[model samples]
Target: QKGPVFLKEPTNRIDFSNSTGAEIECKASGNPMPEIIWIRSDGTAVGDVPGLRQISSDGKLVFPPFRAEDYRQEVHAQVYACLARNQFGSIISRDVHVRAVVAQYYEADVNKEHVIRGNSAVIKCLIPSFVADFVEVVSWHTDEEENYFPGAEYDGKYLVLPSGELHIREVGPEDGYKSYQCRTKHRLTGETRLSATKGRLVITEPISSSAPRTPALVQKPLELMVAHTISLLCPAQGFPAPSFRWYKFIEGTTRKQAVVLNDRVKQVSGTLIIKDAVVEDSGKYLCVVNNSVGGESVETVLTVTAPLSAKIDPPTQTVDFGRPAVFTCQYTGNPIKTVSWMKDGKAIGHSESVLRIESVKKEDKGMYQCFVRNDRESAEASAELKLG
Candidate 1:
């Protein structure tokens, strides 16, 4: 059941300077006088008026010169409330606040350099050193229009004052229009001052950026038994754009087409991507990049090989010097060739599979070479042994 009706909107701001200690009265009109209760925004009951002279009116209203300290708070902004209640219903009067600014300078930083369609930025108040001073307040108000341009006031909501800091959240190229500032106020006297350090800010485009380079081709060979996948990745990057390509490293004439995924030659990210990555893919892959100003390219080597392994007849052995000794050379190569031994820098015999000595000498006790040679190239390795 509703009585007549108690209607009142919350008050926003209350000025205490004029009537400090003066009777402040609040009344709600309804069918019957609503039981009136005075309280602080934090829900604390206001029992007696401090410094302010006060009286109860008809047992339903409070009038007084409210104590200014009754609402003094540093962390929370000042706010007040008047509650009207009766057996039938209740209503709250307007929300109000005491004007006060904190003393401290706020940190302000400007966005660095700018570029054309590519780059734009924002000027944000560094949150760490922010204040609630008049300077900070006006600076905030100045940023809104000159920045977002929505014509909205800086409510402590979307905007906040913690310590002496401020945050502009996300800033983008669209914020290119506005300028920003940082102003601080003194707590005792309400005096304010402006601060500037990071310097001025303006967004604009720059000249054409750098260009890209061209690519080259090369190849490699490895000893192996069976065939396996040869992975290839060609990447190029530049101001405008970049691309990759795989090509043969032939000295002259037409180069063989590449083999990639799906029986093709070149690929992108996956195996089938490069046409056909095979033993042939073991060569230089070219990467090319480009921009409006110019272009450039690069190359990487690819390698193909057979699976092969070697084991000494005796993994380890020791012998006396000045005695005849035999050392063996063995290998598994693509074109199966005989291995040879070397003492110092000279070949013992013309690429012999095994080496023989009438007598072992200390001079030859250090190392014996093992190598295999073909018409095109030669691969060699050596093992060290001690003969006392």
Candidate 2:
């Protein structure tokens, strides 16, 4: 008998339902053309099965009628092992377990029975007993029609188990009625278990009279520092929440780029945190909430302050031209601007918490000014740096 030869596992793993079919083919190939035998894990020979098609010449075993019903027999419940022989020694394939459960969700969990809109929805997947390492990818397909669409991936696009949550990239009305099939791939076996729910993405125009449709607010000034984050809250309060969108209207044009929060911003309960806020992040932020009744919004300006400074108050530094002529101003605020020494009116290009003129030259004498300004406030020193 020859060593058992089998095809590498196929890349595709699918679950069959009703009259639909799924086939697993392994051709017993060896130098002496091995005698291929397929049997249930229970050790019963598969020869008695009606749909079991055997091609002795090629040594391939297939259940031609591999319908959802073909593999439901008692022996078929056992791991299918392939036996090969070619006048040499005999060998068997690693258990290829075969079992058929009703399309009635062979595996069940809390969210197994669920409904979602094609417009916006979350599919909660949890295996029966064990906690899955992490959901690899949330793949969506039509169970009856056999259409697969890549739904929204939550965990870096790979939804994990227990907390395996998946969101749609962008939903539409058509997704509302389609039969969505979720395939949970095992971490090891690569076997896919099927779960289904209806899609419910509905479309409607945005309403302003609704809570999410509250009149917008426009704050004074619109420019700020690069990466500075600001929060804007809509005025109106409505049920079913109005959707929130950020729009920038520059003088006459409006630009919108929907922002999605990551794990860091996942708990965006009240305020929106723009991490490492940048100047480009400054703009008109629109917050809108809505439900089946209608929708509305509120607009506000998010200005990220920039680096700026103010003039010294005394503008005079009495240094004997050989010692440190430390200029002083007790300033307090976010980002205390640095005051520097200057000659004549031109900037000396030196930054010091306290202006020092240790080796002062006759050329280092003049009335200096320290400047500071931000998106919120502006101030100047009153002749603070003076030279004696």
Candidate 3:
């Protein structure tokens, strides 16, 4: 049974807006009308795919229907191909790549936010359904010369929820006097975007209270990536504003000292901020909040994680020809996942960062690249080896 013939090539690729849907078609005619079946680019049957639910009859692949809530999904970006088959033979349509494009503004939920002093408020950070891919995290920061948030970690007076909302409990005059706004980072592009409008914080005096609660540990212990900024808040309330002093206690030791204050290490209104923290920065931090009424202190532990980064020693080297040229790269990351070397775009070896060209030749004059990576991300650097 050899009769089916393709009328024309199926569409190579189909692009759709995520809010919209996707549809792919394939047709062929022979002694018999070729029946169509769908397959993914990975050679998996589309019908067998448990993740894909929206499919069309008559061999047409359709996924165009979704509820409003379903619009934000990972499956929206997938690719497929159509297979036309008969007893005689079979043909697969061109690779039908599917790309979902999201286009919209990334901004905060409000142009203006008003919060009453001594009250609580929630401010939402908005990322349009179309452009969430570019964003890694959404967070709130003060609009002051030093942009930092108090207790913005896993446990803090101000909690930054996974949904990108800032929760402020018992707002104080300090908060009302400073401008608070949302900012986000583009994971891949490393672009930092600030919200369109700055919410002005206005604080009014509250009736004096005789009862004062000790400084509490509302923001809990946190584990964060190294080189990231740290914002810690020590919360205490009383008739008058409280003053805060920060201290550090290294883990596995009895040594404790008042935190060294510097440009990058700062405190404001009972909040402590560490800019671009490092591995050595991981330790226990104590916040002492005091007023004429009384004094309270709480400890917050911090853990810093290092990411993999690679750097080649002596980025460039000139050596006499026919001599062994050894190049070394130092990498920093957890587990030492992978180390590789490449020369002129081709892999030279694997599982090694030290590249030694025994009895070097002019052919090795090209650029040498060293790459190190972990499960999270990869880092690469290049070195030029010249023979004189």
Candidate 4:
């Protein structure tokens, strides 16, 4: 037997469809029939991937038709080398790559369906069950130019099911006549297919026509911390796009005043934004939406809170070296719970707001500080004692 020879080289590349068989021919000739074994050049040893099965008698690497899901679990493409050995030694043939392509094929079928006002409809996907094995992304669209992907919806009407079906509920006049299609993709094959078109709901007018719906608040009664940007979201849907207006209720009065431009109330709309929220910004903000059909409104109570703050009131007193002197430190805050005095950076007597000195004396000269605090924050004020 001589060194192994290639009667024909393996295909440089072979592409396979999902769950389809593929063979790589690496015919080698020697004085004696050479034994052929397949080796993976990608550093993964043989039998590592469960999808790859056995080699054919004709020196062709064989892969059993495994499920498409198995391909996703293993590498769909790999470079392999065919090794031939005999009494004359061994030889390796040119490397060949086997690539598997997975694609979800769409079925052809057109179905007619209809829905009435306040009803629902379902558009079944004509795609085969095997498509689920390779399904990576799926989406549905309506003739009204509305589209929906998995986990997404169309105005709460169109919904995509796990099995690649479209469920449209609460059909209304807004959901007029339309067609639907399920667009699916296979990640392995990078192929896309659009299912056969299916007629969608034809929303018939209701027996009793109603006025424009009252605007329902999506977000309301927002409580934002002070100094942060505030957005009072009142998202509502209406015909003719309802006009929006903002107003704040007068304190202790039922009357409401149109919210004017201020440092705090700089902007107002469907999504009202308060530039810098403050405690005074706390109040009832009413959003009114109106259209020729009807009118609707919502109330959002905005409560703006800030950290507590205070300052010690300093006093200037000039008197005889032996006269009485007093310093009052005023604490101010939403809840001024406690007030204390500090002298020469050290804690002294009174917890009272007033720091009193019986008389002005050389021994009483230094620095005095008033520390004020509440649950949120603290403030400090200092006063220097000038002895005369």
Highest lDDT among the candidates is held by which one? Answer: 3
lDDT (10s digit) by residue, model 3, range 115-162: 446544456565666566566445677666544343344334666643
Which of candidates 2 and 3 reaches a greater TM-score? 3
Q: Which candidate gets the maximum TM-score versus the true structure?
A: 3
Error of 3 at 177 (Å): 10
lDDT of 4: 0.61
Candidates in order, TM-scores: namely: 0.29, 0.29, 0.39, 0.32
Tens digits of per-residue lDDT for model 4, 224-343:
566877665444445544567888999778999897776555432254567666678889888787666777777878767554434444533444687776788865454456777765
Kindly report which residue stretches of model 3 are placed more than 4 angstroms away from their true locations once superposed: 1-204, 210-217, 220-225, 253-255, 309-331, 334-388
Considering lDDT, where higher is better, how would the candidates rank from best to worst?
A: 3, 4, 2, 1
Comparing 2 and 4 on lDDT, the stronger one: 4
In model 4, the number of clashes is 2
Output the worst ten-in-a-row residue range by lDDT, candidate 1. 268-277
The candidate 2 region of ten consecutive residues with least summed lDDT is 9-18
The residue-by-residue lDDT of candidate 1 on 1-388, one tens digit each, is: 2221223433344333323222345655544555666656676546644433233673332233333444444212445556665543333443445443323335444343232332212234443433422233334434454322222224321232222223332234564555555555443345555545433334343345555432254223332222443333333323433333344546334354443335544242211123223444445444444456665644445444432223334322346776776666666544444455554324466566666666766665544446564332344444444566
lDDT per residue for candidate 2 within 1-388, as digits (tens), equals 2223344321122333323333565554545666666655465557645654343334444434455545555633445655454443334443455443333323423243222222234444445543243123345454456533342234332222222334433344454454445667654334566664344334443344343334344345455455443434333333444344544556335755555676433213223445556555556665555556776655667666554434343444456656566565445444444444333223568666456567766655544444343334433332422235
How accurate locally, in lDDT, is each candidate? 0.42, 0.44, 0.62, 0.61
